Design a protein around this motif. Structure first.
Motif, short mmCIF file in Angstrom:
data_model
loop_
_atom_site.label_atom_id
_atom_site.label_comp_id
_atom_site.label_asym_id
_atom_site.label_seq_id
_atom_site.Cartn_x
_atom_site.Cartn_y
_atom_site.Cartn_z
N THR A 125 0.81 -1.21 0.00
CA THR A 125 0.00 0.00 0.00
C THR A 125 0.85 1.27 0.00
O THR A 125 0.32 2.35 -0.25
CB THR A 125 -0.94 0.03 1.21
N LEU A 126 2.15 1.15 0.28
CA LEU A 126 3.00 2.32 0.45
C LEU A 126 3.34 2.98 -0.88
O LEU A 126 3.56 4.19 -0.94
CB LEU A 126 4.27 1.91 1.20
N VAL A 127 3.40 2.20 -1.96
CA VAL A 127 3.87 2.70 -3.25
C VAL A 127 2.83 3.57 -3.95
O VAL A 127 3.16 4.70 -4.36
CB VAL A 127 4.31 1.54 -4.16
N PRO A 128 1.58 3.12 -4.15
CA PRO A 128 0.60 3.99 -4.83
C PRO A 128 0.36 5.30 -4.10
O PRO A 128 0.22 6.35 -4.74
CB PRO A 128 -0.67 3.13 -4.89
N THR A 129 0.33 5.27 -2.76
CA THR A 129 0.14 6.50 -2.00
C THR A 129 1.31 7.45 -2.20
O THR A 129 1.11 8.66 -2.36
CB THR A 129 -0.02 6.17 -0.51
N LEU A 130 2.53 6.92 -2.21
CA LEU A 130 3.71 7.74 -2.44
C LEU A 130 3.68 8.37 -3.83
O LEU A 130 3.99 9.56 -3.98
CB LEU A 130 4.96 6.89 -2.26
N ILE A 131 3.31 7.59 -4.84
CA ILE A 131 3.23 8.14 -6.20
C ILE A 131 2.16 9.23 -6.28
O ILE A 131 2.38 10.28 -6.88
CB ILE A 131 2.97 7.01 -7.21
N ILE A 132 1.00 8.99 -5.65
CA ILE A 132 -0.06 9.99 -5.67
C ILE A 132 0.39 11.28 -4.99
O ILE A 132 0.14 12.38 -5.48
CB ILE A 132 -1.33 9.42 -5.01
N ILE A 133 1.08 11.16 -3.85
CA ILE A 133 1.50 12.34 -3.10
C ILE A 133 2.56 13.12 -3.87
O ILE A 133 2.47 14.35 -3.99
CB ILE A 133 2.00 11.94 -1.70
N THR A 134 3.57 12.43 -4.40
CA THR A 134 4.71 13.11 -4.99
C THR A 134 4.54 13.45 -6.46
O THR A 134 5.37 14.17 -7.01
CB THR A 134 5.98 12.27 -4.81
N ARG A 135 3.49 12.95 -7.12
CA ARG A 135 3.25 13.26 -8.52
C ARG A 135 2.17 14.32 -8.70
O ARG A 135 2.43 15.38 -9.29
CB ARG A 135 2.87 11.98 -9.28
N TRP A 136 0.97 14.06 -8.21
CA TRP A 136 -0.14 15.02 -8.30
C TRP A 136 -0.26 15.88 -7.05
O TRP A 136 -1.32 15.97 -6.44
CB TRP A 136 -1.44 14.27 -8.58
N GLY A 137 0.83 16.53 -6.66
CA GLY A 137 0.84 17.42 -5.52
C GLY A 137 1.11 18.84 -5.96
O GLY A 137 1.88 19.08 -6.89
N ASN A 138 0.48 19.80 -5.27
CA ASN A 138 0.50 21.19 -5.70
C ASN A 138 1.78 21.91 -5.28
O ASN A 138 2.36 22.65 -6.07
CB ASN A 138 -0.73 21.91 -5.14
N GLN A 139 2.24 21.69 -4.05
CA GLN A 139 3.35 22.47 -3.52
C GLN A 139 4.68 21.78 -3.80
O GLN A 139 4.75 20.68 -4.35
CB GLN A 139 3.17 22.68 -2.01
N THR A 140 5.76 22.47 -3.43
CA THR A 140 7.11 21.95 -3.61
C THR A 140 7.59 21.11 -2.43
O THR A 140 8.64 20.46 -2.54
CB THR A 140 8.10 23.09 -3.84
N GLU A 141 6.87 21.10 -1.31
CA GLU A 141 7.22 20.29 -0.16
C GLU A 141 6.64 18.89 -0.23
O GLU A 141 6.81 18.11 0.71
CB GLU A 141 6.77 20.98 1.13
N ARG A 142 5.96 18.55 -1.33
CA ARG A 142 5.42 17.21 -1.49
C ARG A 142 6.52 16.16 -1.54
O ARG A 142 6.32 15.04 -1.07
CB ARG A 142 4.56 17.14 -2.75
N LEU A 143 7.68 16.50 -2.09
CA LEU A 143 8.79 15.55 -2.14
C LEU A 143 9.29 15.22 -0.73
O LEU A 143 9.48 14.05 -0.39
CB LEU A 143 9.92 16.11 -3.00
N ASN A 144 9.49 16.25 0.09
CA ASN A 144 9.93 16.03 1.46
C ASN A 144 8.86 15.29 2.26
O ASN A 144 9.18 14.42 3.08
CB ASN A 144 10.28 17.37 2.11
N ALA A 145 7.59 15.63 2.03
CA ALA A 145 6.51 14.93 2.71
C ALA A 145 6.48 13.45 2.35
O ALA A 145 6.31 12.59 3.23
CB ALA A 145 5.17 15.59 2.37
N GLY A 146 6.65 13.13 1.07
CA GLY A 146 6.70 11.74 0.66
C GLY A 146 7.90 11.01 1.23
O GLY A 146 7.80 9.84 1.61
N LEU A 147 9.05 11.68 1.30
CA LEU A 147 10.22 11.06 1.91
C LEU A 147 9.98 10.74 3.38
O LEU A 147 10.30 9.64 3.85
CB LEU A 147 11.43 11.98 1.76
N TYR A 148 9.40 11.69 4.12
CA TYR A 148 9.06 11.44 5.52
C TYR A 148 8.10 10.27 5.65
O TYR A 148 8.32 9.35 6.46
CB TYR A 148 8.44 12.70 6.14
#
Ligand SMILES: CCCCCCCCCCCCCCCCCC(=O)OC[C@H](COP(=O)([O-])OCC(O)COP(=O)([O-])OC[C@@H](COC(=O)CCCCCCCCCCCCCCCCC)OC(=O)CCCCCCCCCCCCCCCCC)OC(=O)CCCCCCCCCCCCCCCCC
Ligand SMILES: CCCCCCCCCCCCCCCCCC(=O)OC[C@H](COP(=O)([O-])OCC(O)COP(=O)([O-])OC[C@@H](COC(=O)CCCCCCCCCCCCCCCCC)OC(=O)CCCCCCCCCCCCCCCCC)OC(=O)CCCCCCCCCCCCCCCCC
Ligand SMILES: CCCCCCCCCCCCCCCCC[C@@H](O)O[C@H](CO[C@H](O)CCCCCCCCCCCCCCC)COP(=O)(O)OCC[N+](C)(C)C
Ligand SMILES: CCCCCCCCCCCCCCCCC[C@@H](O)O[C@H](CO[C@H](O)CCCCCCCCCCCCCCC)COP(=O)(O)OCC[N+](C)(C)C
Ligand SMILES: CCCCCCCC/C=C\CCCCCCCC(=O)O[C@H](COC(=O)CCCCCCC/C=C/CCCCCCCC)COP(=O)(O)OCCN
Ligand SMILES: CCCCCCCCCCCC(=O)SCCNC(=O)CCNC(=O)[C@H](O)C(C)(C)COP(=O)(O)O
Lengths: 459, 70, 88, 56, 107, 178
Positions: A125-148
């Motif tokens: 379940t971790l992979v699709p959520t990560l792709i959704i967060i880091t691909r279709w995200g509005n801000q620039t902190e989505r990458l750091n959020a996905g890493l966390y």
């Protein structure tokens, strides 16, 4: 169990072979149909379980979670229809594919007769959520959020794999039925203490436990609306379900092991509820409220009494529904204002009365107003904690008062007062948003008529 | 007195339309369900408890009372 | 409520009524456009008491920044009409 | 018009086909766990005159 | 400094598009009125009419596989038997002590 | 409220403000009208004794002990008009105030009702559209260099011109729209 799994798999070719302008309609219709099929699983017995095969079983703890998971997908599609308007057909199909894969992984996770299969899907379940967060995200902190979000979960769950393989090497099986029937006490030993920690921390980090909850505000704020919905509704309950399944082998070690986590959760609900009072972002406030609710669920699971378990199940379902509705309301405001700040858009009840009614009902349900199932779980857990110790009542009452305080603060700040003068692009609410809120809220008030459906196996 | 003024207010069309649509569909499926339940209750259901005759084994759905449950 | 819709004529009549009840200013000399300091020889304290009398008469109170530059009955009536949104 | 709306509406049949296939597979997998049929000590029953299996 | 003060060739940020302007009665589903209307109809029907009503009725009339009234009847017959025979209702030991072989201490 | 504020308050304005506050609080203390008239006349007599004083230092020393005396006896519950910033109905009707641009989102079935009103609204829109383009240049040419020194706006000076920044002052919703 395959009568649910196979249609969910067939959702993928149907989506990829759909017309460029018919993906949403077909996906919504077939997701709703799949949800109807899932309703049959609710019928449950007072005896062992619904053992379909060697691979999958169903229980009155897994059935409400499965029903909620199947019900959430049409709502997520409805919410995502708006902001993905200017997206190419291939990328929209990829988004729908991610949502379908996440549903499939969750469905297979909740049945999971064997613990390594549970771990494999619980990590899948971790992979699709990560792709959704880091691909279709509005801000620039989505990458750091996905890493966390990735690394907190993986650091928590890597020792769990070692613990599980060790348990299978020693006992000989990881099938939950054999584990339950052949359970043996854990001696108070350092090796047993570390095995307990390795078994518990993976589910604790995803609850999130206070002090290990840092990833949640980032992931929830930076995710798109569908990602926030699924994270707040289903992905948080995976830890609770895992703890409920795995605390059968941790006895009698849990009686004294639980204290550090009990203290952390009992103080952290107060801490996060107080944090909610001083917040400038709707999404962050909703996320911290989720943290408080899940901390109280952690307390319930750690107490390990029948009333604790029933209250924890009811509160998990109710919190999922309420948090999804609150996130949807926040997204409706954001798509008009594009700011995500509480103090900017004010007095929206004058401009949008029905949406203000939705806000009021959602806030009342989050406030745990009787006889909603939110208060049913809250009260059962409070009574169980009082039986555990009469001094918990102070912390529980403080949490209740602060919860009411910030819920009504969030309602009043956005809906009441005087409208902001310079904001003039607040169009009337669409039928899609109103239907989304209605489909969020009506199941709660229907479930309060039959609370036994969400009270778990110990009812 | 011809002092009728204009009341500036937001558009109530879309809210009312959504409410009408939701009520229409909910009733569209609920009225037949209510009618069917009423007909079943008046005409058919409410079986009475009995003792199992010797030498007879009942089927699984014969252990329930309400006809819809059976 | 049941409040009659007061008009400009009523506001002017009431302002002139309260002004004519003010013994310091002679009734004959005053005119809608009659100034306070120069045409009638009043003090600034007399002006602030006139503002207070207007306030007590009409049941609403004027901010000091606006009141300190209200120097004729005509502009007092205009201010009151603008505040209460009087049509005619 | 048939043979034209099918080319655009053929996709709708897929989810439903999956459901019936899943039901068939569930029954087929059920068929492999009959080692204790009519052998449980609680539901040990003598067969009816026209009964071969207590459950299917 | 003859630099253009432009970092790169970038499209301007587009302005958000109102669905109501080009199409009143927009329902907020799609920019195409026909697909929009049919999406609204299918969502409303298949959610409210089908699931929210029929599934709720189905859950309401689920047969008792949890066996509540069965337990009521069993308890009623047991209490009738015990009151009549003078037995003291429920017994403290769940299992008969005759069948437990305790281990002799000899301390 | 309507008038633009100044950079500071002069001594005379401060003295007037204290006089008004003292009279209001004396009226609050003295409920009856004859008693209030007597004590207000006595207050005016005590107040205008130092009217003719000339030097700035003693004038500034005065009004200060006066403010302290006012604060000591300020009637902690003074009378307030209902619509005042402290009154019992200060913002009672602010929930009934809807902006004018909300009418632009009405459904055509709703705009079918009241056709004359919407025709007049369209005429107002055209007038605003022209007047704004005139006003931008008028304010650009009239403003002092380096930015405005006060938040006071000039009136219109031409024939067809309208006062700058007039749309949101003229089109206030109402005092009591409903
Ligand atoms: C009390 C019995 C009632 C019996 C009548 C049946 C009522 C059916 C309601 C169904 C559920 C409501 C759905 C929620 C969204 C509302 C839809 C909407 O937009 O309305 C537009 C519609 C049209 O108005 P409009 O002018 O077009 O819209 C303008 C604005 O919307 C402006 O609109 P507004 O200003 O009018 O506000 C909208 C309104 C509606 O919005 C709401 O907030 C209503 C929902 C309140 C519940 C909040 C959650 C708390 C937990 C309750 C869970 C129990 C549910 C029971 C089962 C429900 C089955 C679905 O909000 C309120 O009026 C304030 C609600 C605060 C009430 C607090 C009391 C709650 C606890 C009471 C105990 C209940 C059980 C009794 C047990 C003991 C006795 C047997 O207005 C309505 O029809 C109002 C709905 C009726 C009021 C409901 C109040 C109580 C009912 C609660 C559920 C039924 C209880 C069952 C017991 C029966 C005996
Ligand atoms: C937001 C909304 C979302 C909605 C979502 C969809 C709904 C999901 C849930 C559906 C669940 C349906 C369900 O489970 O039904 C429950 C249940 C089903 O019944 P059952 O348990 O299967 O049957 C019991 C027995 O086995 C059999 O009993 P029986 O055979 O003795 O009874 C006779 C029979 C028929 O009884 C009779 O015909 C006679 C009874 C009254 C006779 C009174 C005297 C009349 C004659 C005198 C006058 C005329 C003749 C004389 C003329 C001359 C006079 C001088 O009973 C009925 O037909 C009851 C009909 C109930 C229909 C329920 C349908 C549910 C539809 C679900 C969707 C609904 C969507 C909304 C639209 C629904 C449609 C509006 O129905 C009720 O619970 C009825 C409640 C009655 C309450 C009485 C008042 C209580 C007040 C207490 C509190 C007061 C203080 C506060
Ligand atoms: C950071 C945000 C929160 C993250 C999550 C925090 C939760 C993790 C905390 C772990 C729970 C407690 C761990 C062990 C509890 C056992 C009880 C023991 O500690 O107490 C005494 C133990 O005495 C001393 O404490 C010995 C241990 C001393 C060394 C431990 C380091 C102390 C602080 C470390 C905290 C660091 C946590 C974070 C790590 C990165 C009892 O004395 P004794 O009867 O003899 O031992 C009984 C156990 N026997 C029977 C197996 C022998
Ligand atoms: C809007 C203005 C008002 C208009 C409406 C006026 C009418 C008012 C009626 C509305 C509520 C009033 C209360 C009346 C309650 C009567 C119905 C009640 O009796 O039925 C309940 C039954 O309700 C259902 O059990 C609960 C609804 C099912 C909820 C499932 C949700 C649907 C799926 C959607 C997705 C799930 C998302 C959440 C995941 C878990 C409880 O019945 P119960 O006593 O027990 O036994 C039933 C009869 N038996 C004995 C034959 C068995
Ligand atoms: C959010 C981040 C959290 C990360 C997880 C924190 C806790 C991790 C749990 C401890 C790590 C090791 C788990 C043990 C795996 C299970 C196997 C087991 O239980 O068997 C024990 C093995 O026990 C161990 O070997 C444990 C050694 C620990 C080494 C690794 C240390 C990692 C960090 C430990 C301190 C931190 C733990 C709590 C962290 C708090 C949260 C940050 C007995 O081994 P035997 O030799 O076969 O039997 C004894 C009789 N002959
Ligand atoms: C119940 C509350 C308690 C009461 C306590 C309050 C105590 C107040 C007593 C203080 C008395 C004073 O004035 S303190 C004396 C301060 N200094 C001066 O007054 C010097 C010049 N005076 C002015 O300029 C005035 O504005 C004036 C000429 C009057 C008007 O002028 P207009 O021509 O522009 O109307």
């Amino acid at each position: 169990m395959l009568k649910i799994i196979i249609p969910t798999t067939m959702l993928l070719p149907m989506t990829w072979m759909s017309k460029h302008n018919m993906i949403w309609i077909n996906a919504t219709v077939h997701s709703l149909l799949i949800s109807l099929i899932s309703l049959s699983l609710l019928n449950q017995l007072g005896e062992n379980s619904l053992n379909f095969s060697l691979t999958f079983f169903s229980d009155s703890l897994s059935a409400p979670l499965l029903v909620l998971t199947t019900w959430l997908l049409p709502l997520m599609l409805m919410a995502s229809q708006s902001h993905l308007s200017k997206e190419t057909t291939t990328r929209k199909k990829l988004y729908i594919t991610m949502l379908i894969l996440l549903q499939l992984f969750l469905i297979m996770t909740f049945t999971a007769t064997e613990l390594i299969l549970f771990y494999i899907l619980f990590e899948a379940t971790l992979v699709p959520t990560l792709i959704i967060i880091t691909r279709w995200g509005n801000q620039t902190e989505r990458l750091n959020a996905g890493l966390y979000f990735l690394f907190y979960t993986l650091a928590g769950s890597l020792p769990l794999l070692v613990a599980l393989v060790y348990i299978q090497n020693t006992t000989g099986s990881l099938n939950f039925l054999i584990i339950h029937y052949w359970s043996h006490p854990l001696s108070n030993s350092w090796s047993n203490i570390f095995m307990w920690l390795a078994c518990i921390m993976a589910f604790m980090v995803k609850m999130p436990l206070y002090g290990l909850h840092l990833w949640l505000p980032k992931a929830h704020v930076e995710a798109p609306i569908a990602g926030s919905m699924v994270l707040a509704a289903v992905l948080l309950k995976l830890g609770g379900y895992g703890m409920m399944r795995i605390t059968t082998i941790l006895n009698p070690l849990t009686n004294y092991m639980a204290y550090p986590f009990l203290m952390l959760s009992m103080w952290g609900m107060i801490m996060t509820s107080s944090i909610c009072l001083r917040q400038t972002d709707l999404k962050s406030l909703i996320a911290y409220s989720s943290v408080s609710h899940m901390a109280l669920v952690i307390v319930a699971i750690m107490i390990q009494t029948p009333w604790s378990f029933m209250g924890a199940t009811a509160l998990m379902i109710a919190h999922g529904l309420t948090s999804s509705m609150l996130f949807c309301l926040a997204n409706t405001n954001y798509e008009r204002v594009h700011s995500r700040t509480m103090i900017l858009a004010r007095g929206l009840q004058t401009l949008l009365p029905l949406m203000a009614t939705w806000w009021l009902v959602a806030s009342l349900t989050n406030l745990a107003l009787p006889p909603s199932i939110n208060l049913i779980g809250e009260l059962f857990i409070i009574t169980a904690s009082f039986s555990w110790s009469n001094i918990t009542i102070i912390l529980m009452g403080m949490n209740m008062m602060i919860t009411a305080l910030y819920s009504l603060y969030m309602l009043i700040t956005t809906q009441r007062g005087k409208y902001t003068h310079h904001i003039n692009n607040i169009k009337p609410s669409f039928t899609r948003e109103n239907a989304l809120m209605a489909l969020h809220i009506l199941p709660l008030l229907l479930l309060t008529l039959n609370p036994k459906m969400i009270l778990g196996p110990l009812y | 007195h011809g002092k009728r003024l204009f009341i500036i207010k937001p558009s109530g069309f879309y809210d009312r339309r959504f409410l009408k649509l939701m009520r229409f569909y909910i009733l569209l499926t609920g009225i037949p369900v209510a009618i069917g339940i009423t007909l079943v209750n008046v005409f058919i259901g409410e079986a009475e408890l009995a003792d199992i005759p010797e030498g007879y084994v009942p089927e699984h759905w014969e252990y329930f009372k309400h006809p819809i449950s059976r | 409520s049941d409040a009659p819709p007061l008009t400009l004529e009523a506001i002017k009549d009431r302002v002139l009524y309260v002004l004519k009840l003010y013994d310091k200013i002679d009734p004959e000399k005053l005119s809608v456009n009659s100034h306070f300091m120069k045409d009638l020889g009043l003090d600034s304290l007399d002006q602030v008491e006139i503002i207070m009398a207007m306030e007590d008469e009409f049941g609403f109170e004027i901010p000091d920044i606006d009141a300190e530059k209200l120097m004729c009955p005509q502009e007092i009536v205009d201010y009151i009409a603008d505040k209460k949104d009087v049509y005619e | 018009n048939v043979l034209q709306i099918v080319r655009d509406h053929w996709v709708h049949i897929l989810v439903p086909v999956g459901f019936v296939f899943g039901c068939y597979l569930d029954r087929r997998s059920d068929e492999k766990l009959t080692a204790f049929r009519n052998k449980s000590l609680l539901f040990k029953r003598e067969l009816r005159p026209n009964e071969e299996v207590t459950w299917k | 400094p003859p630099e253009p003060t432009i970092r790169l060739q970038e499209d301007p940020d587009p302005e958000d598009e109102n669905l109501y302007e080009k199409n009143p009665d927009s329902h907020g589903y799609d920019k195409d009125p026909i697909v929009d209307l049919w999406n609204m109809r299918v969502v409303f029907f298949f959610g409210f009419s089908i699931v929210l009503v029929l599934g709720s009725t189905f859950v309401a009339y689920l047969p008792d596989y949890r066996m509540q009234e069965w337990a009521r009847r069993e308890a009623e017959r047991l209490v009738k038997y015990r009151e009549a025979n003078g037995l003291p209702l429920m017994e403290s030991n769940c299992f008969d002590p005759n069948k437990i072989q305790l281990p002799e201490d000899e301390d | 409220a309507f008038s633009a504020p100044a950079a500071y308050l002069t001594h005379q304005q401060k003295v007037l403000r204290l006089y008004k506050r003292a009279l209001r609080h004396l009226e609050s203390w003295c409920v009856h009208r004859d008693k209030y008239r007597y004590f207000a006349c006595l207050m005016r007599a005590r107040f205008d004794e130092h009217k003719n004083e000339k030097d700035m230092v003693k004038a500034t020393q005065l009004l200060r002990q006066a403010e302290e005396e006012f604060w000591y006896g300020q009637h902690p519950q003074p009378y307030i008009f209902p619509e005042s910033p402290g009154g019992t109905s200060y913002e009672r009707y602010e929930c009934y105030k809807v902006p004018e641009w909300c009418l632009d989102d009405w459904h055509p079935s709703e705009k079918a009702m009241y056709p004359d009103y919407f025709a007049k609204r369209e005429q107002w829109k055209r007038l605003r559209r022209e007047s704004w383009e005139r006003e931008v240049k008028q304010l650009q040419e009239e403003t002092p260099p380096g930015g405005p020194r006060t938040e006071a706006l000039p009136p219109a000076r031409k024939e067809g011109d309208l006062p700058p920044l007039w749309w949101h002052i003229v089109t206030r919703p109402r005092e009591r729209p409903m």
